[model samples]
Target: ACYCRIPACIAGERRYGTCIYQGALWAFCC
Candidate 1:
């Protein structure tokens, strides 16, 4: 499991995003 989780928004349905990496954050708001 990941130490933490990251999230972001896309268009619709999906609503947002997430990740479970080592110890970093995912990019978003492109």
Candidate 2:
């Protein structure tokens, strides 16, 4: 319900927003 979960959510949400797969929030996909 925090960092780990949030990352997975982002990836599935946008097909892997860099951050989710790379462990960096600023690396999200545009």
Question: Residues 1-30, candidate 2, lDDT per residue (tens digit)?
Answer: 223334334543433333444544543332
Clashes of each: 0, 0
Can you write out model 1's per-residue Cα lDDT over 1-30, one digit (the tens) per residue? Answer: 122224554443232334546776653332
Instruction: List candidate 2 stretches off by more than 4 Å.
Output: 1-19, 27-30
Q: Candidate 1, which segments miss by more than 4 Å at Cα?
A: 1-16, 27-30
Candidate 2: minimum summed lDDT over ten consecutive residues — where? 1-10
TM-score of predicted model 2? 0.15
- Residue 7 accuracy (lDDT) in model 2: 33
